[PDB]
């Protein structure tokens, strides 16, 4: 509903991506350990 | 025991380190120790396991129509157990004779 | 309806905006050349290379 509403209406030192990649790597390592 | 040993080896090598090799590239967290795990257990183990699986797949394929790999199916193994039964009957008879002898004392 | 409100990245980056000054910053952005090819040169030379 939010996507459809948006479609109808349209007509520095943060490193958030680094933290997200670190969390993804940690999750992948945890999944491998669980396997 | 050839096929049994082959199956045992395939089972022991089924759980290879390839599934656990997903944490080898992150080992470089000290400079721009166990970095060797990213070489031997990255893809070579999986390649060898796949090669072994393919080799095991391409066997003679003996079983075609009916019931092969038989081999008992038949005779005096039954009569072998029957001879064991005769041995038991002789044991019983010997025991009866021994009881009679003991009574004869 | 506001950018699908579910703060779990912006709030975390704001709460941990300062925890590493000059420790790394070398194995995070320049880590795209450590191990480039480790399995891409062994999957097309087993079965696809035969035909």
From Swiss-Prot, chain A:
Tissue spec: Ubiquitous.
Protein's cellular compartments: Nucleus
Family: Belongs to the Mediator complex subunit 17 family.
UniProt disease annotation: Microcephaly, postnatal progressive, with seizures and brain atrophy: A disorder characterized by postnatal progressive microcephaly and severe developmental retardation associated with cerebral and cerebellar atrophy. Infants manifest swallowing difficulties leading to failure to thrive, jitteriness, poor visual fixation, truncal arching, seizures. There is no acquisition of developmental milestones and patients suffer from marked spasticity and profound retardation. Progressive microcephaly becomes evident few months after birth.
Subunit-structure text: Interacts with GATA1 and PPARG. Component of the Mediator complex, which is composed of MED1, MED4, MED6, MED7, MED8, MED9, MED10, MED11, MED12, MED13, MED13L, MED14, MED15, MED16, MED17, MED18, MED19, MED20, MED21, MED22, MED23, MED24, MED25, MED26, MED27, MED29, MED30, MED31, CCNC, CDK8 and CDC2L6/CDK11. The MED12, MED13, CCNC and CDK8 subunits form a distinct module termed the CDK8 module. Mediator containing the CDK8 module is less active than Mediator lacking this module in supporting transcriptional activation.
Role, per record: Component of the Mediator complex, a coactivator involved in the regulated transcription of nearly all RNA polymerase II-dependent genes. Mediator functions as a bridge to convey information from gene-specific regulatory proteins to the basal RNA polymerase II transcription machinery. Mediator is recruited to promoters by direct interactions with regulatory proteins and serves as a scaffold for the assembly of a functional preinitiation complex with RNA polymerase II and the general transcription factors.
Residues of the full protein shown: 110 to 163 of 651
From Swiss-Prot, chain B:
Major place of residence: nucleus
Location of the protein in the cell: Nucleus
Superkingdom as given in the UniProt entry: Eukaryota
Pfam families to which the protein is assigned, alphabetical: Med11 (PF10280)
Gene3D superfamilies from the UniProt entry: 1.10.287.3490
GO CC annotation terms, alphabetical: core mediator complex; mediator complex; nucleoplasm; nucleus; ubiquitin ligase complex
GO BP field: positive regulation of transcription elongation by RNA polymerase II; positive regulation of transcription initiation by RNA polymerase II; protein ubiquitination; RNA polymerase II preinitiation complex assembly
Entry keywords, A to Z: Acetylation, Activator, Disease variant, Epilepsy, Neurodegeneration, Nucleus, Transcription, Transcription regulation
Gene Ontology terms for molecular function: transcription coregulator activity; ubiquitin protein ligase activity
Annotated function: Component of the Mediator complex, a coactivator involved in the regulated transcription of nearly all RNA polymerase II-dependent genes. Mediator functions as a bridge to convey information from gene-specific regulatory proteins to the basal RNA polymerase II transcription machinery. Mediator is recruited to promoters by direct interactions with regulatory proteins and serves as a scaffold for theee assembly of a functional pre-initiation complex with RNA polymerase II and the general transcription factors.
Protein name from the UniProt record: Mediator of RNA polymerase II transcription subunit 11
Natural source organism: Homo sapiens (Human)
Swiss-Prot record, chain C:
Top-level taxon of origin: Eukaryota
Region (Interaction with the Elongin BC complex): 34-43
Location(s), subcellular: Nucleus
Coiled coil: 25-51
Entry's family note: Belongs to the Mediator complex subunit 8 family.
Subunit structure comment from the entry: Component of the Mediator complex, which is composed of MED1, MED4, MED6, MED7, MED8, MED9, MED10, MED11, MED12, MED13, MED13L, MED14, MED15, MED16, MED17, MED18, MED19, MED20, MED21, MED22, MED23, MED24, MED25, MED26, MED27, MED29, MED30, MED31, CCNC, CDK8 and CDC2L6/CDK11. The MED12, MED13, CCNC and CDK8 subunits form a distinct module termed the CDK8 module. Mediator containing the CDK8 module is less active than Mediator lacking this module in supporting transcriptional activation.
Biological role: Component of the Mediator complex, a coactivator involved in the regulated transcription of nearly all RNA polymerase II-dependent genes. Mediator functions as a bridge to convey information from gene-specific regulatory proteins to the basal RNA polymerase II transcription machinery. Mediator is recruited to promoters by direct interactions with regulatory proteins and serves as a scaffold for the assembly of a functional preinitiation complex with RNA polymerase II and the general transcription factors.
Record note on domains: The elongin BC complex binding domain is also known as BC-box with the consensus [APST]-L-x(3)-C-x(3)-[AILV].
Protein name per UniProt: Mediator of RNA polymerase II transcription subunit 8
Species of the source: Homo sapiens (Human)
Residues shown, of full length: 109 to 159 of 268
